[PDB]
Design an enzyme around this catalytic site. Structure first.
Site, short mmCIF file in Angstrom:
data_model
loop_
_atom_site.label_atom_id
_atom_site.label_comp_id
_atom_site.label_asym_id
_atom_site.label_seq_id
_atom_site.Cartn_x
_atom_site.Cartn_y
_atom_site.Cartn_z
N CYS A 193 -6.86 -1.86 11.53
CA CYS A 193 -5.67 -2.67 10.99
C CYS A 193 -4.30 -1.85 11.15
O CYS A 193 -3.24 -2.43 10.74
CB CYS A 193 -5.66 -2.91 9.54
SG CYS A 193 -7.26 -3.89 9.04
N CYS A 230 -3.54 -6.31 6.54
CA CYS A 230 -4.05 -5.64 7.68
C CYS A 230 -3.20 -5.80 8.92
O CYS A 230 -3.36 -6.94 9.51
CB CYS A 230 -5.52 -6.17 7.81
SG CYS A 230 -6.30 -5.99 9.38
N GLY A 231 -2.56 -4.95 9.42
CA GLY A 231 -1.79 -4.92 10.46
C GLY A 231 -2.28 -5.83 11.70
O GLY A 231 -1.93 -6.86 12.01
N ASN A 238 -9.61 6.53 3.26
CA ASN A 238 -9.64 5.55 2.37
C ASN A 238 -9.69 6.26 1.13
O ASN A 238 -9.96 7.45 0.98
CB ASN A 238 -11.03 4.63 2.57
CG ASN A 238 -11.07 3.52 1.63
OD1 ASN A 238 -12.11 3.02 1.45
ND2 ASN A 238 -9.77 3.03 1.35
N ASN A 298 -3.16 0.90 9.85
CA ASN A 298 -2.38 0.70 8.54
C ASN A 298 -1.62 2.27 8.79
O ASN A 298 -1.82 3.28 9.35
CB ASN A 298 -3.29 1.01 7.52
CG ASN A 298 -4.25 -0.12 7.47
OD1 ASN A 298 -3.82 -1.38 7.48
ND2 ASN A 298 -5.66 -0.01 7.55
N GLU A 336 -11.55 -7.84 6.24
CA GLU A 336 -11.79 -6.58 6.97
C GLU A 336 -13.45 -6.26 6.93
O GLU A 336 -13.90 -6.46 6.13
CB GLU A 336 -11.08 -5.43 6.63
CG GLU A 336 -9.55 -5.76 6.27
CD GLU A 336 -8.92 -4.35 6.09
OE1 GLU A 336 -9.49 -3.36 5.65
OE2 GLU A 336 -7.46 -4.33 5.91
N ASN A 339 0.89 -1.08 -0.04
CA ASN A 339 -0.14 -0.02 0.01
C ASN A 339 0.80 1.29 0.02
O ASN A 339 1.91 1.64 0.73
CB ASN A 339 -0.98 0.04 1.23
CG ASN A 339 -2.28 -0.62 0.89
OD1 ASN A 339 -2.96 -0.31 -0.16
ND2 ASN A 339 -2.73 -1.30 1.79
N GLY A 342 -4.85 -7.51 11.87
CA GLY A 342 -5.12 -9.18 11.52
C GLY A 342 -4.15 -9.89 11.95
O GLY A 342 -4.18 -11.30 12.16
N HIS A 350 -11.67 -9.72 16.38
CA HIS A 350 -10.80 -10.36 15.42
C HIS A 350 -11.29 -12.20 15.55
O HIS A 350 -11.26 -12.47 16.54
CB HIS A 350 -9.31 -10.43 15.34
CG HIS A 350 -8.89 -9.08 14.95
ND1 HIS A 350 -8.83 -9.33 13.29
CD2 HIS A 350 -8.39 -7.99 15.29
CE1 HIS A 350 -8.31 -8.00 13.11
NE2 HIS A 350 -7.93 -7.41 14.01
#
Length: 274
Positions: free
Chosen positions: A73, A217-218, A64, A75, A208, A11, A220, A159
């Site tokens: 996540c 996704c961190g 986003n 991010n 997600e 990303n 996750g 989660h």
């Protein structure tokens, strides 16, 4: 307005120093800038804002490409760390930043890698939240297409982890949505599918909630490793292979925070009027 482009885990982001700039974007603006042909082009855009709390060093909010202010996540946490130091907004090796969802502590390793502290994973069912009589290392979830076994954790968001034979053939498209919006999950959940290679190496794919399958996704990755360690299937310090990239997850059992190590690369700096 000046900005800097960076990337991590597949990303690419557009970081902006909102601490010395009175920037403010609207869904439209963001969508326009996010355009790869008529804008700067990016998957996400995060703004470094001043934290109205003497306790924290910084505060940031990811966006986003749609213009919606996301917050999950963790991010661009490393990108934020790398950016904040590169531009010289701080000199501290340890930074305490806050997001829409709680906060975290990031440390810039000499290896130029960024170690993040995701705190301790919450196991209490009702505190996830997850409707279950009592805590279990393996909860039985029933979906229209099949009943599955999974683990439920919490970093800040709910989660659900499911083990698979092969990451590439994992019915994420069908099961993911089924698990994401399950009745036993009052506030929905992030369905993660992981395949165990070694006791220190696993591949994974997260679905997600309210978003679907993304690049990486961190959170996750952290959850996956947590249940794995709690299940006794994984050792401490495990590498997570996500579609976007890899991550070094570290955890030493209950009573210990969970650390997530990864890297962020700075590409270039730019200036754009309005």
């Amino acid at each position: 307005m000046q900005f800097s482009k960076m990337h991590g885990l597949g990303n690419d982001f557009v970081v902006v120093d909102g601490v010395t700039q009175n920037v403010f974007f609207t869904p439209e603006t963001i969508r326009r800038l996010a355009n790869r042909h008529c804008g700067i082009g990016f998957d996400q855009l995060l703004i470094v804002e001043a934290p109205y709390d003497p306790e924290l060093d910084f505060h940031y909010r990811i966006f986003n490409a749609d213009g919606s202010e996301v917050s999950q996540c963790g991010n661009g946490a490393r990108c934020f760390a790398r950016f904040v130091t590169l531009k010289g907004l701080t000199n501290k090796k340890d930074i305490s930043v806050s997001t829409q969802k709680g906060n975290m502590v990031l440390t810039v390793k000499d290896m130029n890698q960024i170690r993040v502290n995701m705190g301790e994973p919450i196991w209490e069912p009702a505190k996830i939240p997850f409707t279950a009589n009592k805590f279990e290392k393996n909860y039985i979830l029933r979906t229209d297409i099949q009943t599955v076994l999974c683990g439920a954790v919490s970093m800040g968001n709910p989660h659900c982890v499911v083990q698979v034979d092969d990451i590439q053939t994992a019915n994420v498209e069908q099961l993911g949505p089924l698990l994401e919006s399950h009745e036993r999950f009052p506030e929905r959940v992030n369905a993660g599918f992981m395949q165990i290679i070694n006791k220190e190496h696993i591949k994974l794919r997260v679905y997600e909630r309210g978003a679907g399958e993304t690049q990486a996704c961190g959170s996750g990755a952290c959850a996956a490793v947590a249940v794995g360690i709690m299940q006794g299937l994984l050792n401490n310090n495990v590498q997570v292979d996500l579609p976007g990239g890899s991550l070094m997850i570290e955890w030493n059992g209950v009573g210990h925070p969970l650390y997530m190590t990864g890297e962020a690369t700075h590409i270039y700096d730019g200036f754009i009027t309005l």
